[PDB]
């Protein structure tokens, strides 16, 4: 995945 | 009136009536908005005047607001400002050959377009090029993506450039599982709370910013 996950 | 939720300014030139109808339809069908939900825009037929557009059971109605500082719907009731005209018609209904009391303002979803951190045309490679010339963690920009209603926050963290996808989902914006009213609200939240690890959005990056706090070539 090219984009970071935000939680 | 400029910072009011309901003031949309110039929409689009003469396509503003259709844009206002679309904006009201989108807000009203999405949120289950009541009749009288409205916005004010610059008139495209009567230059210098304003147009009040409001919701009426699935149909959008438009009313001319004369600006001579004298603001008015009817030659009988004149106001000093647009705020006073709107506030008065939120408590007392306006009449036509139906009666309508103004209710909830339809806010703008596009206030980000004037922000120093926003780029309407910027590639993933283009953002990485600009951010590699700013040797500060927390340097960031927001760029429009190729999908409609999609954006990316490009930021500098741990010496590298990372990207986050932001989706405009109707009348709100989503960043993972977090929800905000708008892209401006999302960015203002992540300037005070970490977006990635302990990194907050600290340094808004545009061309003006690069000549001041940037290097000539990337790292």
Numbering used by the authors:
A (entry chain C): 479 to 485
B (entry chain A): 545 to 556, 558 to 613, 619 to 647, 649 to 770
What does the paper say about this structure?
We reasoned that the linker region separating the PLCγ1 cSH2 and SH3 domains could have interfered with the binding of the pK15 12mer peptide to the PLCγ1 cSH2 domain, since the former contains tyrosine residue 783, which is known to interact with the PLCγ1 cSH2 domain. We therefore expressed and purified a truncated PLCγ1 tSH2 domain (PLCγ1 aa 545–772), which lacks this linker segment. We obtained diffraction quality crystals of this truncated tSH2 domain in complex with the 12mer phosphorylated pK15 peptide. The structure was determined by the molecular replacement method and refined to a resolution of 2.1Å. In the PLCγ1 cSH2 domain the pK15 peptide straddles the triple ß-sheet that divides the two pockets of the SH2 domain. Its phosphorylated tyrosine residue (pK15 Y481) is in contact with PLCγ1 R675 and R694 in the first of these two pockets, while its hydrophobic residues V484 and L485 in the canonical pK15 SH2-binding site (YEEVL) are in proximity to the second pocket that is known to accommodate hydrophobic residues. The pK15 peptide adopts a similar position to that of residues 781–790 in the PLCγ1 linker peptide containing phosphorylated Y783, which connects the PLCγ1 tSH2 and SH3 domains. The unphosphorylated Y783 sidechain in the cSH2-SH3 linker segment is oriented away from the phosphotyrosine-binding pocket of the cSH2 domain, while the phosphorylated Y783 sidechain superposes well with the K15Y481 side chain. We therefore propose that, following phosphorylation of pK15 on Y481, the last 12 amino acids of the pK15 cytoplasmic domain engage the PLCγ1 cSH2 domain in a manner similar to the PLCγ1 tSH2-SH3 domain linker, once the latter has been phosphorylated on Y783 by the activating receptor tyrosine kinase.
Kaposi Sarcoma-associated herpesvirus (KSHV) causes three human malignancies, Kaposi Sarcoma (KS), Primary Effusion Lymphoma (PEL) and the plasma cell variant of multicentric Castleman’s Disease (MCD), as well as an inflammatory cytokine syndrome (KICS). Its non-structural membrane protein, pK15, is among a limited set of viral proteins expressed in KSHV-infected KS tumor cells. Following its phosphorylation by Src family tyrosine kinases, pK15 recruits phospholipase C gamma 1 (PLCγ1) to activate downstream signaling cascades such as the MEK/ERK, NFkB and PI3K pathway, and thereby contributes to the increased proliferation and migration as well as the spindle cell morphology of KSHV-infected endothelial cells. PLCγ1 is a member of the phospholipase C family, which includes several enzymes that hydrolyze phosphatidylinositol 4,5-biphosphate (PIP2) to two important second messengers, inositol 1,4,5-triphosphate (IP3) and diacylglycerol (DAG). Activation of PLCγ1 occurs due to the intramolecular binding of the phosphorylated Y783 to the cSH2 domain, which leads to conformational changes in the protein and the release of the cSH2 domain from the catalytic core of PLCγ1, thus rendering the latter accessible to the substrate PIP2.
